[PDB]
Design a protein around this ligand. Structure first.
Ligand SMILES: [Zn+2]
Ligand SMILES: [Zn+2]
Lengths: 48, 468
């Protein structure tokens, strides 16, 4: 004719937010982004 | 305080991105729930969808205005857009009043995480003519050594990047330097004394020194191949010695901003380099430096290393306290967290990229400086194009001793020709200011006849005819 009562407790979280390895950024630089319409980029030649 | 005319126009426009109705929308036609709401211009998810790698700083100014100004009272107008400082406050607001005896955590510079900048000041550098920079590479084709220059230009809006400013250049000035096959190094005192008088004539012509260029070619065999490929993914993007020259040039030219507490922030300066592509050509590329970490530590702690990708970190001598620099890299087995307890940290991380390009030849708004681009430049003493008044009989001559005004005014709009005339200061400064304004602006026909009727232009063609 009796009872059992017990509560609980929690811990939410911690974070660091660590990212961006160096090998991904070196590949991130050597690319293209697009050029409007007529914004050619050119070639050039010389030094015969 | 007053900012630039281009900077105030980007602030007034919101730059919102409209969206259309979708299947996922459950609301009515006269509304928007979340899927057809107006998109903010600072969301990086829309940026990398169209392969834009940065968030267009005027929109980054808007994403911090939402954090500064809120719906609550506030009553502050803080606008926290300032340069983050790594120097040590001496007063320190505590009991450790000298730094020789005492330092706590509220004045100690924190460990640099090396996070990349997500916003760039200049979003897209553009040029005026392919014949302008063709003379710059032609300087290398005659003496075989590297060159140097400074780019004068202006700014305007850019509609491709959402809330972005594009960089326009008009002419390139070369300072007197000592060339060398490996690299180059000139005196900063004679350049600064020479650049002071060029800034005088740039004010009336509407020009500003906002860029610089330096060449790096290393020709392979002068036959089928154009140049070697020095800068690639495995090699360095920018050498650490040229990071120092790029950092001092941005600190000398600040950008005025009302949102900053000091009055100046987010310098708009471009550094372009001629290096060549991977396969076969001499295609150029440009990157500018980062403001968040690199722009302030260059006053005290940047030291040169033997590696072009990295730069050495020196030691503290009683005032120059530096924090530890960390970055992530892969080990021999896996990918690990920050390892750097070692000097010679890389400097390619602290560079943000730009998109260079040349406009179409069929149409433009204006070009404003295409006269010949074949006149001998002012400080090209290594090349043979450094002539005296013998060139003025060959270049313009008031063509065939009786020139038509449609063929005479087209030659007078050159940048280096007008900068060579006023150095002799034959004309009055009032008549010279209307001379350069006639050559650079439209409806010039009524004012060109005013120049030929003046006695100063008559004395210029008379003193040229008797001389060789
Ligand atoms: Zn909706
Ligand atoms: Zn302190």
């Amino acid at each position: 004719q009796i009872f059992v009562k017990t509560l609980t407790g929690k811990t939410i979280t911690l974070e660091v937010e660590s990212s961006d390895t160096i090998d991904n950024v070196k590949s991130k630089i050597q690319d293209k982004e697009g050029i409007p319409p007529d914004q050619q980029r050119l070639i050039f030649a010389g030094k015969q | 305080i007053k900012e630039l005319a281009v900077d105030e126009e980007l602030e007034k426009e919101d730059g919102l991105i409209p969206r259309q109705k979708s299947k996922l929308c459950k609301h009515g036609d006269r509304g928007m729930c979340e899927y057809c709401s107006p998109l903010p211009p600072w969301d990086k998810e829309y940026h990398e969808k169209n392969k834009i790698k940065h968030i267009s700083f005027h929109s980054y100014l808007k994403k911090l205005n939402e954090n500064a100004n809120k719906k609550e009272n506030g009553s502050s107008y803080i606008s926290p857009l300032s340069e983050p400082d790594f120097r040590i406050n001496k007063r320190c607001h505590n009991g450790h009043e000298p730094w020789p005896r005492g330092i706590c955590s509220k004045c100690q510079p924190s460990a640099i995480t090396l996070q990349q900048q997500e916003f760039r000041m200049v979003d897209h550098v553009e040029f005026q003519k392919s014949e302008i920079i063709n003379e710059f590479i032609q300087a290398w084709r005659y003496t075989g050594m590297q060159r140097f220059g400074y780019m004068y230009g202006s700014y305007s809006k850019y509609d491709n990047t959402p809330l972005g400013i594009k960089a326009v250049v008009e002419a390139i000035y070369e300072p007197p330097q000592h060339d060398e096959q490996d690299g180059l190094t000139m005196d900063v005192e004679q350049v600064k004394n020479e650049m002071l008088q060029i800034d005088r004539q740039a004010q009336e012509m509407g020009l500003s020194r906002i860029g610089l260029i330096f060449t790096d070619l290393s020709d392979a065999g002068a036959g089928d191949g154009s140049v070697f490929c020095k800068r690639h993914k495995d090699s360095f993007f920018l050498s650490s010695l040229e990071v120092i020259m790029a950092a001092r040039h941005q600190t000398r030219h600040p950008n005025v901003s009302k949102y900053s507490e000091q009055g100046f922030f987010s310098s708009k300066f471009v550094t372009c380099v001629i290096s060549g592509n991977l396969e076969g050509e001499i295609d150029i590329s440009s990157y500018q430096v980062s403001t968040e970490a690199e722009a302030l530590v260059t006053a005290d702690m940047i030291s040169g290393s033997t590696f072009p990708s990295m730069a050495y970190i020196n030691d503290t001598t009683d005032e120059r306290y530096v924090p530890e620099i960390f970055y992530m890299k892969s080990n021999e087995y896996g990918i690990t967290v920050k390892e750097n307890a070692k000097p010679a940290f890389p400097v390619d991380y602290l560079l943000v990229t730009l998109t260079h390009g040349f406009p179409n030849t069929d149409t433009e708004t204006n070009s404003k400086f295409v006269s010949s681009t074949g006149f001998p430049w002012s400080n090209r003493q290594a090349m043979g194009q450094s002539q005296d008044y013998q060139e003025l009989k060959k270049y313009l001559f008031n063509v065939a001793s009786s020139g038509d005004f449609n063929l005479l005014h087209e030659k007078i709009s050159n940048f280096h020709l007008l900068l060579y005339i006023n150095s002799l200061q034959i004309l009055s400064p009032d008549e010279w200011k209307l001379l350069i304004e006639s050559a650079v602006k439209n409806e010039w026909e009524e004012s060109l006849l005013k120049l030929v009727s003046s006695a100063g232009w008559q004395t210029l063609v008379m003193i040229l005819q008797e001389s060789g």
